[PDB]
Amino acid sequence: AKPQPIAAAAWKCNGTTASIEKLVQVFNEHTISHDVQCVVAPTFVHIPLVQAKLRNPKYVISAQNAIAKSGAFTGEVSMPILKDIGVHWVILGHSERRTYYGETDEIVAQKVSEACKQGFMVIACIGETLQQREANQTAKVVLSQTSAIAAKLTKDAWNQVVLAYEPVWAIGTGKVATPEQAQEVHLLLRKWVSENIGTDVAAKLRILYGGSVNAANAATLYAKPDINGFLVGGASLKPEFRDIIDATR
Amino acid sequence: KPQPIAAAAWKCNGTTASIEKLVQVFNEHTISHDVQCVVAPTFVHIPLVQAKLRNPKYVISAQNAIAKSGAFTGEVSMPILKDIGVHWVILGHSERRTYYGETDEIVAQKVSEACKQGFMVIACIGETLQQREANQTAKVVLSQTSAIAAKLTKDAWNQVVLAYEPVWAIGTGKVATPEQAQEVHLLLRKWVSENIGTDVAAKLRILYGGSVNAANAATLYAKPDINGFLVGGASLKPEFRDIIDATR
Numbered sequence: 001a002k003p004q005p006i007a008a009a010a011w012k013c014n015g016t017t018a019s020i021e022k023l024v025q026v027f028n029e030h031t032i033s034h035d036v037q038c039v040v041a042p043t044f045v046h047i048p049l050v051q052a053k054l055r056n057p058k059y060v061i062s063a064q065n066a067i068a069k070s071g072a073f074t075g076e077v078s079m080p081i082l083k084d085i086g087v088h089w090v091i092l093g094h095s096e097r098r099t100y101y102g103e104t105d106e107i108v109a110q111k112v113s114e115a116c117k118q119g120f121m122v123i124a125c126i127g128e129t130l131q132q133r134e135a136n137q138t139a140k141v142v143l144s145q146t147s148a149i150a151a152k153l154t155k156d157a158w159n160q161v162v163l164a165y166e167p168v169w170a171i172g173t174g175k176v177a178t179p180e181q182a183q184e185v186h187l188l189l190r191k192w193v194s195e196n197i198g199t200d201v202a203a204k205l206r207i208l209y210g211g212s213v214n215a216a217n218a219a220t221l222y223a224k225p226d227i228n229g230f231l232v233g234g235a236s237l238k239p240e241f242r243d244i245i246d247a248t249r
Numbered sequence: 250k251p252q253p254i255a256a257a258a259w260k261c262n263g264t265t266a267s268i269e270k271l272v273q274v275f276n277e278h279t280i281s282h283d284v285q286c287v288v289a290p291t292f293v294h295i296p297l298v299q300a301k302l303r304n305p306k307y308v309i310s311a312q313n314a315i316a317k318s319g320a321f322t323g324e325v326s327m328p329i330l331k332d333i334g335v336h337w338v339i340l341g342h343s344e345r346r347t348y349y350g351e352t353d354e355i356v357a358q359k360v361s362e363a364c365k366q367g368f369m370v371i372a373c374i375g376e377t378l379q380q381r382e383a384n385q386t387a388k389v390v391l392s393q394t395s396a397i398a399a400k401l402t403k404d405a406w407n408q409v410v411l412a413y414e415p416v417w418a419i420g421t422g423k424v425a426t427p428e429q430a431q432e433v434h435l436l437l438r439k440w441v442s443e444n445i446g447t448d449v450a451a452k453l454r455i456l457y458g459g460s461v462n463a464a465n466a467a468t469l470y471a472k473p474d475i476n477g478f479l480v481g482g483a484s485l486k487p488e489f490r491d492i493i494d495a496t497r
């Protein structure tokens with residue numbers, strides 16, 4: 001009854017030609033037998049290298065960011081440029097972009113809507129800070145972030161949308177997030193989607209956990225009913241990512 | 250006059266078909282004078298250009314970078330650029346100063362880290378129409394340059410290239426004359442003359458980053474303090490060859 005699992009490797013801004021070639025070979029020799037959509041998300045300059053080496057049939061390639069339109073945007077990569085090179089997935093609204101580079105709900109929701117219009121599969125990120133979690137605002141924030149995105153989409157566009165919950169309150173703060181605390185936000189989000197968008201949309205929507213995931217807690221995390229996979233960080237740069245994929249069965 | 254530079258600022262434009270076609274046109278254009286030609290494609294197009302662009306007079310630059318690798322989603326670091334073989338970088342572009350939070354101090358730190366890591370930097374400065382109309386042309390460009398200069402040693406200036414953008418002429422209905430461009434280049438080199446050293450000022454490349462095409466590149470490069478161009482829309486066209494020939 002669960003939708004198709006997703007295991008996304010968020011390499012962030014890391015990697016060398018030797019690093020990636022060695023890691024991609026590990027990914028390719030890993031035989032995966034269950035239905036699961038795997039995702040590598042390298043830096044822009046490494047997309048051609050990954051395109052040349054990544055062969056495992058379970059995988060697609062995603063950009064870590066994009067802008068909606070080509071033009072006078074020095075330093076940025078546009079979605080049409082990404083379609084032309086053969087990339088159909090993109091991560092939008094990551095906490096690091098909302099924090100360091102000032103991406104707002106209006107910017108993130110506009111990127112998701114324009115990516116859905118241009119045929120992208122989107123992993124849209126939401127999450128709340130510790131200060132927000134201290135104020136009993138987890139729902140207030142993650143639903144305000146999810147409503148802003150939904151306000152620019154129609155029903156059919158939700159088949160391209162994937163949500164990734166970032167427990168930002170458990171990132172670099174010295175605080176930890178339990179598999180029960182993750183399942184709580186994951187069901188909180190699905191019920192909002194069930195109520196506001198549709199019941200069939202909620203049951204099929206993939207909600208990924210974007211917190212600390214390793215080979216030890218992946219299966220127990222995926223054991224929860226409203227967790228549909230992971231947005232893996234540190235462990236994704238390791239052969240450990242194979243075990244994380246194994247745990248989505 | 251030091252070695253001129255002809256840089257192609259492609260911005261966020263291009264496909265694999267159009268880049269491969271234009272690179273071949275650049276490949277069939279023989280350049281027989283001392284000039285450093287630069288092509289700066291999007292991050293995704295850097296491997297294509299490195300493989301295909303074969304003119305010995307060209308190098309490949311990035312349009313942006315950050316100092317260190319790590320948990321910075323969507324960004325490309327400077328060590329990653331060095332590992333893939335990129336040794337040039339455009340920093341502090343007006344579009345990033347305007348729309349992506351690159352303050353004078355953020356540009357200054359990026360330039361400093363880039364020179365520390367062995368990068369050739371094209372650092373961009375320029376003033377708005379509001380600023381120019383407030384008689385702030387010197388105030389803005391020198392404040393942008395002095396922030397960059399406070400993070401650089403004398404030897405690091407041999408890796409830095411200044412690119413003046415007449416931002417007051419972009420999308421404003423105003424246009425910049427060569428005499429207005431030379432005026433800014435002059436006072437730029439003169440501040441370096443009197444705050445870094447007469448030696449660095451003489452050998453500093455200061456590129457014009459306004460409207461450059463085949464019709465005006467010669468008249469522009471004829472100005473004594475203009476050392477080349479950071480070319481926009483014309484850089485995606487075969488007439489970039491005529492701009493290179495205008496730096497003779």
Ligand SMILES: [Cl-]
Nearest residue numbers: 238239240241
């Ligand atoms: Cl490992």
